[PDB]
């Protein structure tokens, strides 16, 4: 299954995941794809969000209902 997740600068990152990835594991795959600067924002100070929901880390993307082409937003927390 492949997502889109807009990043803090509003870049476009493209992910491979499977349907019951966890956002922690979709959270590692946002980490290493993204760029330097964000090396010093540590990885419980982002949330994501899709379709108004904060998503927890621990539940997975099935949980949520997110389906392939589903475009997730990292956001502060």
Do not use: C
């Not at 949980?63 to 589903?70: F, G, R, V």
């Amino acid at each position: 299954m492949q997502i889109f997740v807009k990043t803090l600068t509003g870049k476009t990152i493209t992910l491979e995941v499977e349907p019951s990835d966890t956002i922690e594991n979709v959270k590692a795959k946002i980490q290493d794809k993204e760029g330097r600067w964000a090396l010093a924002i540590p990885p419980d100070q982002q949330r994501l969000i899709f379709a108004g929901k904060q998503l927890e880390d621990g539940r997975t993307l099935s949980d949520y209902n997110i389906q392939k082409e589903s475009t997730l937003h990292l956001v502060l927390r």
